[PDB]
Design a protein around this nucleic acid. Structure first.
Ligand SMILES: [K+]
Ligand SMILES: [K+]
Ligand SMILES: [Mg+2]
Ligand SMILES: [Mg+2]
Ligand SMILES: [Mg+2]
Ligand SMILES: [Mg+2]
Ligand SMILES: [Mg+2]
Ligand SMILES: [Mg+2]
Ligand SMILES: [Mg+2]
Ligand SMILES: [Mg+2]
Ligand SMILES: [Mg+2]
Ligand SMILES: [Mg+2]
Ligand SMILES: [Mg+2]
Ligand SMILES: [Mg+2]
Ligand SMILES: [Mg+2]
Ligand SMILES: [Mg+2]
Ligand SMILES: [Mg+2]
Ligand SMILES: [Mg+2]
Ligand SMILES: [Mg+2]
Ligand SMILES: [Mg+2]
Ligand SMILES: [Mg+2]
Ligand SMILES: [Mg+2]
Ligand SMILES: [Mg+2]
Ligand SMILES: [Mg+2]
Ligand SMILES: [Mg+2]
Ligand SMILES: [Mg+2]
Ligand SMILES: [Mg+2]
Ligand SMILES: [Mg+2]
Ligand SMILES: [Mg+2]
Ligand SMILES: [Mg+2]
Ligand SMILES: [Mg+2]
Ligand SMILES: [Mg+2]
Ligand SMILES: [Mg+2]
Ligand SMILES: [Mg+2]
Ligand SMILES: [Mg+2]
Ligand SMILES: [Mg+2]
Ligand SMILES: [Mg+2]
Ligand SMILES: [Mg+2]
Ligand SMILES: [Mg+2]
Ligand SMILES: [Mg+2]
Ligand SMILES: [Mg+2]
Ligand SMILES: [Mg+2]
Ligand SMILES: [Mg+2]
Ligand SMILES: [Mg+2]
Ligand SMILES: [Mg+2]
Ligand SMILES: [Mg+2]
Ligand SMILES: [Mg+2]
Ligand SMILES: [Mg+2]
Ligand SMILES: [Mg+2]
Ligand SMILES: [Mg+2]
Ligand SMILES: [Mg+2]
Ligand SMILES: [Mg+2]
Ligand SMILES: [Mg+2]
Ligand SMILES: [Mg+2]
Ligand SMILES: [Mg+2]
Ligand SMILES: [Mg+2]
Ligand SMILES: [Mg+2]
Ligand SMILES: [Mg+2]
Ligand SMILES: [Mg+2]
Ligand SMILES: [Mg+2]
Ligand SMILES: [Mg+2]
Ligand SMILES: [Mg+2]
Ligand SMILES: [Mg+2]
Ligand SMILES: [Mg+2]
Ligand SMILES: [Mg+2]
Ligand SMILES: [Mg+2]
Ligand SMILES: [Mg+2]
Ligand SMILES: [Mg+2]
Ligand SMILES: [Mg+2]
Ligand SMILES: [Mg+2]
Ligand SMILES: [Mg+2]
Ligand SMILES: [Mg+2]
Ligand SMILES: [Mg+2]
Ligand SMILES: [Mg+2]
Ligand SMILES: [Mg+2]
Ligand SMILES: [Mg+2]
Ligand SMILES: [Mg+2]
Ligand SMILES: [Mg+2]
Ligand SMILES: [Mg+2]
Ligand SMILES: [Mg+2]
Ligand SMILES: [Mg+2]
Ligand SMILES: [Mg+2]
Ligand SMILES: [Mg+2]
Ligand SMILES: [Mg+2]
Ligand SMILES: [Mg+2]
Ligand SMILES: [Mg+2]
Ligand SMILES: [Mg+2]
Ligand SMILES: [Mg+2]
Ligand SMILES: [Mg+2]
Ligand SMILES: [Mg+2]
Ligand SMILES: [Mg+2]
Ligand SMILES: [Mg+2]
Ligand SMILES: [Mg+2]
Ligand SMILES: [Mg+2]
Ligand SMILES: [Mg+2]
Ligand SMILES: [Mg+2]
Ligand SMILES: [Mg+2]
Ligand SMILES: [Mg+2]
Ligand SMILES: [Mg+2]
Ligand SMILES: [Mg+2]
Ligand SMILES: [Mg+2]
Ligand SMILES: [Mg+2]
Ligand SMILES: [Mg+2]
Ligand SMILES: [Mg+2]
Ligand SMILES: [Mg+2]
Ligand SMILES: [Mg+2]
Ligand SMILES: [Mg+2]
Ligand SMILES: [Mg+2]
Ligand SMILES: [Mg+2]
Ligand SMILES: [Mg+2]
Ligand SMILES: [Mg+2]
Ligand SMILES: [Mg+2]
Ligand SMILES: [Mg+2]
Ligand SMILES: [Mg+2]
Ligand SMILES: [Mg+2]
Ligand SMILES: [Mg+2]
Ligand SMILES: [Mg+2]
Ligand SMILES: [Mg+2]
Ligand SMILES: [Mg+2]
Ligand SMILES: [Mg+2]
Ligand SMILES: [Mg+2]
Ligand SMILES: [Mg+2]
Ligand SMILES: [Mg+2]
Ligand SMILES: [Mg+2]
Ligand SMILES: [Mg+2]
Ligand SMILES: [Mg+2]
Ligand SMILES: [Mg+2]
Ligand SMILES: [Mg+2]
Ligand SMILES: [Mg+2]
Ligand SMILES: [Mg+2]
Ligand SMILES: [Mg+2]
Ligand SMILES: [Mg+2]
Ligand SMILES: [Mg+2]
Ligand SMILES: [Mg+2]
Ligand SMILES: [Mg+2]
Ligand SMILES: [Mg+2]
Ligand SMILES: [Mg+2]
Ligand SMILES: [Mg+2]
Ligand SMILES: [Mg+2]
Ligand SMILES: [Mg+2]
Ligand SMILES: [Mg+2]
Ligand SMILES: [Mg+2]
Ligand SMILES: [Mg+2]
Ligand SMILES: [Mg+2]
Ligand SMILES: [Mg+2]
Ligand SMILES: [Mg+2]
Ligand SMILES: [Mg+2]
Ligand SMILES: [Mg+2]
Ligand SMILES: [Mg+2]
Ligand SMILES: [Mg+2]
Ligand SMILES: [Mg+2]
Ligand SMILES: [Mg+2]
Ligand SMILES: [Mg+2]
Ligand SMILES: [Mg+2]
Ligand SMILES: [Mg+2]
Ligand SMILES: [Mg+2]
Ligand SMILES: [Mg+2]
Ligand SMILES: [Mg+2]
Ligand SMILES: [Mg+2]
Ligand SMILES: [Mg+2]
Ligand SMILES: [Mg+2]
Ligand SMILES: [Mg+2]
Ligand SMILES: [Mg+2]
Ligand SMILES: [Mg+2]
Ligand SMILES: [Mg+2]
Ligand SMILES: [Mg+2]
Ligand SMILES: [Mg+2]
Ligand SMILES: [Mg+2]
Ligand SMILES: [Mg+2]
Ligand SMILES: [Mg+2]
Ligand SMILES: [Mg+2]
Ligand SMILES: [Mg+2]
Ligand SMILES: [Mg+2]
Ligand SMILES: [Mg+2]
Ligand SMILES: [Mg+2]
Ligand SMILES: [Mg+2]
Ligand SMILES: [Mg+2]
Ligand SMILES: [Mg+2]
Ligand SMILES: [Mg+2]
Ligand SMILES: [Mg+2]
Ligand SMILES: [Mg+2]
Ligand SMILES: [Mg+2]
Ligand SMILES: [Mg+2]
Ligand SMILES: [Mg+2]
Ligand SMILES: [Mg+2]
Ligand SMILES: [Mg+2]
Ligand SMILES: [Mg+2]
Ligand SMILES: [Mg+2]
Ligand SMILES: [Mg+2]
Ligand SMILES: [Mg+2]
Ligand SMILES: [Mg+2]
Ligand SMILES: [Mg+2]
Ligand SMILES: [Mg+2]
Ligand SMILES: [Mg+2]
Ligand SMILES: [Mg+2]
Ligand SMILES: [Mg+2]
Ligand SMILES: [Mg+2]
Ligand SMILES: [Mg+2]
Ligand SMILES: [Mg+2]
Ligand SMILES: [Mg+2]
Ligand SMILES: [Mg+2]
Ligand SMILES: [Mg+2]
Ligand SMILES: [Mg+2]
Ligand SMILES: [Mg+2]
Ligand SMILES: [Mg+2]
Ligand SMILES: [Mg+2]
Ligand SMILES: [Mg+2]
Ligand SMILES: [Mg+2]
Ligand SMILES: [Mg+2]
Ligand SMILES: [Mg+2]
Ligand SMILES: [Mg+2]
Ligand SMILES: [Mg+2]
Ligand SMILES: [Mg+2]
Ligand SMILES: [Mg+2]
Ligand SMILES: [Mg+2]
Ligand SMILES: [Mg+2]
Ligand SMILES: [Mg+2]
Ligand SMILES: [Mg+2]
Ligand SMILES: [Mg+2]
Ligand SMILES: [Mg+2]
Ligand SMILES: [Mg+2]
Ligand SMILES: [Mg+2]
Ligand SMILES: [Mg+2]
Ligand SMILES: [Mg+2]
Ligand SMILES: [Mg+2]
Ligand SMILES: [Mg+2]
Ligand SMILES: [Mg+2]
Ligand SMILES: [Mg+2]
Ligand SMILES: [Mg+2]
Ligand SMILES: [Mg+2]
Ligand SMILES: [Mg+2]
Ligand SMILES: [Mg+2]
Ligand SMILES: [Mg+2]
Ligand SMILES: [Mg+2]
Ligand SMILES: [Mg+2]
Ligand SMILES: [Mg+2]
Ligand SMILES: [Mg+2]
Ligand SMILES: [Mg+2]
Ligand SMILES: [Mg+2]
Ligand SMILES: [Mg+2]
Ligand SMILES: [Mg+2]
Ligand SMILES: [Mg+2]
Ligand SMILES: [Mg+2]
Ligand SMILES: [Mg+2]
Ligand SMILES: [Mg+2]
Ligand SMILES: [Mg+2]
Ligand SMILES: [Mg+2]
Ligand SMILES: [Mg+2]
Ligand SMILES: [Mg+2]
Ligand SMILES: [Mg+2]
Ligand SMILES: [Mg+2]
Ligand SMILES: [Mg+2]
Ligand SMILES: [Mg+2]
Ligand SMILES: [Mg+2]
Ligand SMILES: [Mg+2]
Ligand SMILES: [Mg+2]
Ligand SMILES: [Mg+2]
Ligand SMILES: [Mg+2]
Ligand SMILES: [Mg+2]
Ligand SMILES: [Mg+2]
Ligand SMILES: [Mg+2]
Ligand SMILES: [Mg+2]
Ligand SMILES: [Mg+2]
Ligand SMILES: [Mg+2]
Ligand SMILES: [Mg+2]
Ligand SMILES: [Mg+2]
Ligand SMILES: [Mg+2]
Ligand SMILES: [Mg+2]
Ligand SMILES: [Mg+2]
Ligand SMILES: [Mg+2]
Ligand SMILES: [Mg+2]
Ligand SMILES: [Mg+2]
Ligand SMILES: [Mg+2]
Ligand SMILES: [Mg+2]
Ligand SMILES: [Mg+2]
Ligand SMILES: [Mg+2]
Ligand SMILES: [Mg+2]
Ligand SMILES: [Mg+2]
Ligand SMILES: [Mg+2]
Ligand SMILES: [Mg+2]
Ligand SMILES: [Mg+2]
Ligand SMILES: [Mg+2]
Ligand SMILES: [Mg+2]
Ligand SMILES: [Mg+2]
Ligand SMILES: [Mg+2]
Ligand SMILES: [Mg+2]
Ligand SMILES: [Mg+2]
Ligand SMILES: [Mg+2]
Ligand SMILES: [Mg+2]
Ligand SMILES: [Mg+2]
Ligand SMILES: [Mg+2]
Ligand SMILES: [Mg+2]
Ligand SMILES: [Mg+2]
Ligand SMILES: [Mg+2]
Ligand SMILES: [Mg+2]
Ligand SMILES: [Mg+2]
Ligand SMILES: [Mg+2]
Ligand SMILES: [Mg+2]
Ligand SMILES: [Mg+2]
Ligand SMILES: [Mg+2]
Ligand SMILES: [Mg+2]
Ligand SMILES: [Mg+2]
Ligand SMILES: [Mg+2]
Ligand SMILES: [Mg+2]
Ligand SMILES: [Mg+2]
Ligand SMILES: [Mg+2]
Lengths: 45, 92, 271
RNA sequence: AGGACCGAACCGACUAAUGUCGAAAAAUUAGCGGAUGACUUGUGGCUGGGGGUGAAAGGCCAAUCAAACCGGGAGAUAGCU
RNA sequence: GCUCGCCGGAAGACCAAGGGUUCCUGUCCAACGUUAAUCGGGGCAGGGUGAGUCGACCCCUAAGGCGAGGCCGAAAGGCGUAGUCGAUGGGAAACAGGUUAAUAUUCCUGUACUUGGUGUUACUGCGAAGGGGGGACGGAGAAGGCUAUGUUGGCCGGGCGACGGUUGUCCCGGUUUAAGCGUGUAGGCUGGUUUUCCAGGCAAAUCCGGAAAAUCAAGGCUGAGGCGUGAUGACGAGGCACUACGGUGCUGAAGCAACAAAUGCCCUGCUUCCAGGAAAAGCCUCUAAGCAUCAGGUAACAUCAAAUCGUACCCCAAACCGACACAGGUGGUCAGGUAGAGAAUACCAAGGCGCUUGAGAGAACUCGGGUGAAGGAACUAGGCAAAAUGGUGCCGUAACUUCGGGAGAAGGCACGCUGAUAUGUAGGUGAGGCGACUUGCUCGUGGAGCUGAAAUCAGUCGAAGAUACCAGCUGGCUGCAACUGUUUAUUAAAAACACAGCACUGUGCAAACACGAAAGUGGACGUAUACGGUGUGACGCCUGCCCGGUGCCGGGAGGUUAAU
């Protein structure tokens, strides 16, 4: 009966993508965190 | 015309039923090419290395199949195949 | 004419249309048109600054001429057109040289009449002049507040300023509010009254008529909860607080004028 | 002509029964309201937490809302169990 | 394999999104599959996605995003200009047939189409960061002309019927063919030109706009369709051929005509209405800075090219979103027969499926239905729930009314079939003809066929003729809310919110006000017949007394009164 996740790869990357994170001061800190924690999937891309 | 590099394009001749059926009836050869490899670069490689009259080259990129080895999942490499049509002067 | 619509459906019952027979029926002159995208009341920050606006019919902007830059050049009024961006109508004026422009249509105007503007010209409805050149005690509109600018005052349907007095460099104007404002004599003003005076007798008739004019529903403070509006709460239609805007400032008799710069020009406040 | 009438699609959700460790963390069956408009819908935008948005119910803001979620102050504090 | 059953405006066929090998073949059933499993969307190998034309990328833009300098901000950074991104929109061109176990507008055959490049040659003025045109647009409505498609004849090939008939008005099957090119019609739209002239389109213009005219009346424009050709071809129902009983490979008949007909197409059109309906390139044109045998345009036979990426498969679902092979959710397209107003509904076609536990028994009880003597709301908080009414045409229809309505008020009657009027008519409809008018896709006679209501009259069967599905229950008094609308996603749909209308009130434009340390935005490219706030809530009759209290507004003498 209509759930919250309605996927779209454009929206996905525009919202949460590498370049979208790179764009901002705070977005670069997210990446800086995931790199410090040492994640494989740095962003969804 | 692009000497030295042409030699690196053609990887191996492809073996299959679809590959065989297009030898005698359609007058083509199916072959595994480099991931770069443009239709001109394949044609030009076949024109010198294989040395046969090329009518036209058609190309496609085959996606690698996700395999499994007990636990660690692993994808195959994305190889490219090239259906190269030949003129009436044909052989191999 | 002002034609009342017959009551063939509830919603139709009360509709009163302002059917002007002289307007043009067809597409407008493209060179003066341009796009006019809607805000929905939101700004730079994307936030509702002005409430109750959003939706309505799509509508293009006509480049109307308030300045009236053409001096000593006659101009034939080709056709009166409907303007969705305005209360008043507009007139497609064809200048003798070749140009065409939209202007606000005064009261006494039709397709075929000639208009001149500039310094000399004649004293007649539609003819734009400097306010010095216009006789004292006359009906004007499209009035400038600064010399060389467009035209700020009296632009709505049936609206007009009256020139009361003329003190040297300054002109005392009595505005439609009742406010007597002192403007510079070098400023221009289009003679006569702004047309489409029947506009005010239109009555919409239904909710959707306001929605297709771009208005949205106005929820009363009293209807809301105390967290939303200062008027709020109560167990069954209470009030008991003094009338106020959603931001606490008192409405209903509370002077918000505080310009200070232009208080010299205002000869007398409205009443 | 119409926020006109009847009525499928489409949108809704009035009544009842079933279900209530369900087929389903809101549905099914039989009837029900709107259905050229203040309609509905695809795709992409914009608005951010005392902030948004709200035809106003304290509704809604990712199954969370009289102040979201995640990390941090942080082993807050507890005359209580 | 044969029956049976079910869907068929889907439970069929295509896609976008989203998945990401689930597709196809061979093998293997431990686990997964709510049972078994030789089967599998499961495990393990191999194979499978072929493009100048489809989409993406590419040339251009909306919302909006980013944003050199810039303005603003303790820092971080906010806003925003020239630019540059951003489709959900605009811009070049391919179809029919055959083919794989799996791709096809991609491969193959037969036909085509676009844009560039570089020529060869004929002529010649070109040329923008610039001007003009075009692109280029709303709702509803109506009408004509068509088409997909169907139906019925004819035509062609087969059939002479397992139980009475069937050599016929009989039966079954077929009757297919595209983009392209030619033709420029049904029809839309517009007075052509030819010359001069002019403070306009920041410069310039032979373009665009204006102004004289002179001068024949048409010349352009757009456009479905049909006809030709494309096509002697392609394709074609059976046959034959072989059989590895998989099929392989060989032949190929008619391949027409009327009628009906879209929600498609002309139509981005026409009439009408107002709430008055994106942008920007490609394209066409005119000249500046220039260039003047030049380069540059133009046309024409060539020629070279048309890169790269996606293409399997699911896509109302066992493959997406719901933790599941979860009866939920998910945008676009295609739309056959009979009955019908219909995309409703019933039964079917194409095509697909029978829902991954079965076999018995035939207790209570539960769930979903069917029928019910006599009574008929006696039930119950309450006719909750069932039962009932239902269609089309005609006759008829009250108080009250804002003069529209109430109203489908109420209530009736007629409905099947078969002949007749009429070897099927009112109409639709249009052929061989015949004018004629010229070369037409002609006007204008004209009535062969197909097509076909609705009636009236007379029979006739049944208990019942709108016989199934489908398909209002009606009336009287009255509270509230004028009305359609909106609302507590997931216990409240209402009298609550909104609403049109009404009043008070602020606001004179660097507007009030709002978002914002600010710049700045919105209000508004609006300007008091406008805008914001508050209350009230269509419409009719109205809206009374109080300014002591709290607020607001005005007034400035006097008292008290901060910083200094
Ligand atoms: K602490
Ligand atoms: K004093
Ligand atoms: Mg999830
Ligand atoms: Mg978003
Ligand atoms: Mg965001
Ligand atoms: Mg930034
Ligand atoms: Mg930002
Ligand atoms: Mg680590
Ligand atoms: Mg790694
Ligand atoms: Mg080829
Ligand atoms: Mg090819
Ligand atoms: Mg390819
Ligand atoms: Mg690898
Ligand atoms: Mg424009
Ligand atoms: Mg704006
Ligand atoms: Mg912004
Ligand atoms: Mg922002
Ligand atoms: Mg406001
Ligand atoms: Mg308002
Ligand atoms: Mg407006
Ligand atoms: Mg209001
Ligand atoms: Mg209100
Ligand atoms: Mg209000
Ligand atoms: Mg209330
Ligand atoms: Mg409330
Ligand atoms: Mg708020
Ligand atoms: Mg408060
Ligand atoms: Mg309350
Ligand atoms: Mg309460
Ligand atoms: Mg209340
Ligand atoms: Mg009370
Ligand atoms: Mg009280
Ligand atoms: Mg207050
Ligand atoms: Mg209508
Ligand atoms: Mg209606
Ligand atoms: Mg209706
Ligand atoms: Mg249905
Ligand atoms: Mg629905
Ligand atoms: Mg839907
Ligand atoms: Mg729905
Ligand atoms: Mg629903
Ligand atoms: Mg539901
Ligand atoms: Mg009930
Ligand atoms: Mg219920
Ligand atoms: Mg109830
Ligand atoms: Mg039930
Ligand atoms: Mg249970
Ligand atoms: Mg239902
Ligand atoms: Mg109904
Ligand atoms: Mg319904
Ligand atoms: Mg209704
Ligand atoms: Mg209805
Ligand atoms: Mg509307
Ligand atoms: Mg889309
Ligand atoms: Mg959205
Ligand atoms: Mg937000
Ligand atoms: Mg908070
Ligand atoms: Mg916080
Ligand atoms: Mg706080
Ligand atoms: Mg709302
Ligand atoms: Mg409450
Ligand atoms: Mg809401
Ligand atoms: Mg709190
Ligand atoms: Mg938290
Ligand atoms: Mg603790
Ligand atoms: Mg404590
Ligand atoms: Mg069936
Ligand atoms: Mg059915
Ligand atoms: Mg169908
Ligand atoms: Mg549909
Ligand atoms: Mg049907
Ligand atoms: Mg399907
Ligand atoms: Mg995909
Ligand atoms: Mg998945
Ligand atoms: Mg797999
Ligand atoms: Mg497989
Ligand atoms: Mg399979
Ligand atoms: Mg197998
Ligand atoms: Mg076995
Ligand atoms: Mg299992
Ligand atoms: Mg098992
Ligand atoms: Mg299970
Ligand atoms: Mg076993
Ligand atoms: Mg298998
Ligand atoms: Mg498998
Ligand atoms: Mg394994
Ligand atoms: Mg192609
Ligand atoms: Mg391509
Ligand atoms: Mg080709
Ligand atoms: Mg294309
Ligand atoms: Mg590319
Ligand atoms: Mg732009
Ligand atoms: Mg913007
Ligand atoms: Mg910015
Ligand atoms: Mg600069
Ligand atoms: Mg900067
Ligand atoms: Mg400045
Ligand atoms: Mg910054
Ligand atoms: Mg800085
Ligand atoms: Mg910024
Ligand atoms: Mg810009
Ligand atoms: Mg771009
Ligand atoms: Mg892109
Ligand atoms: Mg697109
Ligand atoms: Mg597009
Ligand atoms: Mg495109
Ligand atoms: Mg075009
Ligand atoms: Mg293109
Ligand atoms: Mg397939
Ligand atoms: Mg081809
Ligand atoms: Mg050949
Ligand atoms: Mg040929
Ligand atoms: Mg040929
Ligand atoms: Mg060719
Ligand atoms: Mg040709
Ligand atoms: Mg052509
Ligand atoms: Mg060419
Ligand atoms: Mg080159
Ligand atoms: Mg050249
Ligand atoms: Mg050259
Ligand atoms: Mg060159
Ligand atoms: Mg040369
Ligand atoms: Mg030469
Ligand atoms: Mg020229
Ligand atoms: Mg030129
Ligand atoms: Mg230009
Ligand atoms: Mg241009
Ligand atoms: Mg233009
Ligand atoms: Mg468009
Ligand atoms: Mg339209
Ligand atoms: Mg129109
Ligand atoms: Mg329309
Ligand atoms: Mg109409
Ligand atoms: Mg007619
Ligand atoms: Mg007709
Ligand atoms: Mg039609
Ligand atoms: Mg027709
Ligand atoms: Mg046809
Ligand atoms: Mg056809
Ligand atoms: Mg049909
Ligand atoms: Mg057909
Ligand atoms: Mg028939
Ligand atoms: Mg038949
Ligand atoms: Mg015949
Ligand atoms: Mg014969
Ligand atoms: Mg025979
Ligand atoms: Mg016989
Ligand atoms: Mg027999
Ligand atoms: Mg017999
Ligand atoms: Mg016999
Ligand atoms: Mg038959
Ligand atoms: Mg033919
Ligand atoms: Mg055709
Ligand atoms: Mg074509
Ligand atoms: Mg040709
Ligand atoms: Mg022609
Ligand atoms: Mg002609
Ligand atoms: Mg044409
Ligand atoms: Mg014609
Ligand atoms: Mg000039
Ligand atoms: Mg000029
Ligand atoms: Mg010229
Ligand atoms: Mg000219
Ligand atoms: Mg001219
Ligand atoms: Mg045609
Ligand atoms: Mg023909
Ligand atoms: Mg032919
Ligand atoms: Mg022929
Ligand atoms: Mg042949
Ligand atoms: Mg054949
Ligand atoms: Mg035979
Ligand atoms: Mg042969
Ligand atoms: Mg043949
Ligand atoms: Mg033959
Ligand atoms: Mg024969
Ligand atoms: Mg023959
Ligand atoms: Mg035919
Ligand atoms: Mg014919
Ligand atoms: Mg016939
Ligand atoms: Mg015909
Ligand atoms: Mg017909
Ligand atoms: Mg039809
Ligand atoms: Mg329709
Ligand atoms: Mg349609
Ligand atoms: Mg159309
Ligand atoms: Mg342009
Ligand atoms: Mg030219
Ligand atoms: Mg040359
Ligand atoms: Mg050119
Ligand atoms: Mg040629
Ligand atoms: Mg050629
Ligand atoms: Mg070539
Ligand atoms: Mg496919
Ligand atoms: Mg399929
Ligand atoms: Mg479904
Ligand atoms: Mg569907
Ligand atoms: Mg389906
Ligand atoms: Mg299913
Ligand atoms: Mg679930
Ligand atoms: Mg399962
Ligand atoms: Mg299952
Ligand atoms: Mg699932
Ligand atoms: Mg399911
Ligand atoms: Mg979609
Ligand atoms: Mg029939
Ligand atoms: Mg029928
Ligand atoms: Mg019926
Ligand atoms: Mg159905
Ligand atoms: Mg049948
Ligand atoms: Mg079948
Ligand atoms: Mg099956
Ligand atoms: Mg079965
Ligand atoms: Mg089966
Ligand atoms: Mg027993
Ligand atoms: Mg029993
Ligand atoms: Mg039983
Ligand atoms: Mg029951
Ligand atoms: Mg029972
Ligand atoms: Mg029952
Ligand atoms: Mg029954
Ligand atoms: Mg019963
Ligand atoms: Mg009974
Ligand atoms: Mg009984
Ligand atoms: Mg009895
Ligand atoms: Mg009885
Ligand atoms: Mg009784
Ligand atoms: Mg009782
Ligand atoms: Mg009792
Ligand atoms: Mg009682
Ligand atoms: Mg009931
Ligand atoms: Mg019933
Ligand atoms: Mg009945
Ligand atoms: Mg009556
Ligand atoms: Mg009565
Ligand atoms: Mg009446
Ligand atoms: Mg009554
Ligand atoms: Mg009725
Ligand atoms: Mg009745
Ligand atoms: Mg009746
Ligand atoms: Mg009644
Ligand atoms: Mg009745
Ligand atoms: Mg019957
Ligand atoms: Mg006769
Ligand atoms: Mg008869
Ligand atoms: Mg007949
Ligand atoms: Mg008869
Ligand atoms: Mg006859
Ligand atoms: Mg007849
Ligand atoms: Mg006729
Ligand atoms: Mg004729
Ligand atoms: Mg005709
Ligand atoms: Mg004939
Ligand atoms: Mg004829
Ligand atoms: Mg003849
Ligand atoms: Mg004839
Ligand atoms: Mg003749
Ligand atoms: Mg003819
Ligand atoms: Mg003729
Ligand atoms: Mg004629
Ligand atoms: Mg005729
Ligand atoms: Mg006649
Ligand atoms: Mg006749
Ligand atoms: Mg007949
Ligand atoms: Mg009788
Ligand atoms: Mg008898
Ligand atoms: Mg009888
Ligand atoms: Mg009988
Ligand atoms: Mg009866
Ligand atoms: Mg019946
Ligand atoms: Mg009956
Ligand atoms: Mg009914
Ligand atoms: Mg009565
Ligand atoms: Mg009474
Ligand atoms: Mg009473
Ligand atoms: Mg009463
Ligand atoms: Mg009472
Ligand atoms: Mg009362
Ligand atoms: Mg009342
Ligand atoms: Mg109500
Ligand atoms: Mg709702
Ligand atoms: Mg609720
Ligand atoms: Mg609740
Ligand atoms: Mg309700
Ligand atoms: Mg409810
Ligand atoms: Mg109301
Ligand atoms: Mg009044
Ligand atoms: Mg008052
Ligand atoms: Mg006022
Ligand atoms: Mg602030
Ligand atoms: Mg700041
Ligand atoms: Mg400011
Ligand atoms: Mg502003
Ligand atoms: Mg604007
Ligand atoms: Mg209210
Ligand atoms: Mg009242
Ligand atoms: Mg009220
Ligand atoms: Mg009255
Ligand atoms: Mg009084
Ligand atoms: Mg007093
Ligand atoms: Mg006193
Ligand atoms: Mg005062
Ligand atoms: Mg005071
Ligand atoms: Mg004072
Ligand atoms: Mg004082
Ligand atoms: Mg004093
Ligand atoms: Mg003192």
């Amino acid at each position: 009966m209509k759930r919250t996740f309605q996927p779209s790869v454009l929206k996905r990357n525009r919202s949460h993508g590498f370049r979208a994170r790179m764009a901002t001061k705070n977005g670069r800190q997210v990446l800086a965190r995931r790199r410090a924690k040492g994640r494989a999937r740095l962003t969804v891309s | 015309i692009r000497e030295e590099r042409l030699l690196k394009v053609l990887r191996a001749p492809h073996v299959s039923e679809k590959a065989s059926t297009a030898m005698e009836k359609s007058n083509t050869i199916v072959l595994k090419v480099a991931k770069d490899a443009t239709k001109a670069e394949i044609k030009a490689a076949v024109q010198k290395l294989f040395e046969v009259e090329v009518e036209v080259v058609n190309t496609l990129v085959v996606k690698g199949k996700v395999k499994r080895h007990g636990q660690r999942i692993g994808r195959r490499s994305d190889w490219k195949k090239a259906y190269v049509t030949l003129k009436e002067g044909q052989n191999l | 004419a002002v034609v009342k619509c017959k009551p063939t459906s509830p919603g139709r019952r009360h509709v009163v249309k302002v059917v002007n027979p002289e307007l043009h029926k067809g597409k407008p002159f493209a060179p003066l048109l341009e796009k006019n995208s809607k805000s929905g009341g939101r700004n730079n920050n994307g936030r509702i600054t002005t409430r109750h606006i959003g939706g309505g019919h799509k509508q293009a902007y006509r480049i109307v001429d308030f300045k009236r830059n053409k001096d000593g050049i006659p101009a034939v009024v080709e056709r009166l057109e409907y303007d969705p961006n305005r209360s008043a109508n507009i007139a497609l004026v064809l200048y003798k040289d070749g140009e065409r422009r939209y202007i606000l249509a005064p009261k006494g105007l039709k397709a075929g009449d000639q208009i001149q503007s500039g310094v000399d010209a004649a004293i007649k409805p539609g003819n734009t002049l400097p306010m010095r050149n216009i006789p004292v005690g006359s009906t004007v509109h499209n009035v400038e507040m600064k010399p060389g600018k467009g035209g700020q005052l009296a632009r709505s349907a049936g609206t007009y300023v009256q020139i009361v007095a003329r003190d040297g460099a300054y002109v005392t104007l009595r505005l439609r509010s009742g406010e007597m404002r002192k403007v510079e004599a070098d400023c221009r003003a289009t003679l006569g009254e702004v047309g489409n005076a029947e506009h005010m007798l239109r009555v919409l008739g239904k909710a959707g008529a306001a929605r297709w004019r771009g208005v949205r529903p106005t929820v009363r403070g009293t209807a809301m909860n105390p967290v939303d509006h200062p008027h709020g709460g109560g167990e069954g239609r209470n009030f008991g607080k003094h009338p106020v805007t959603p931001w606490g400032v008192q409405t209903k008799g509370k002077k918000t004028r505080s310009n200070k710069r232009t208080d010299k020009f205002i000869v007398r406040r409205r009443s």
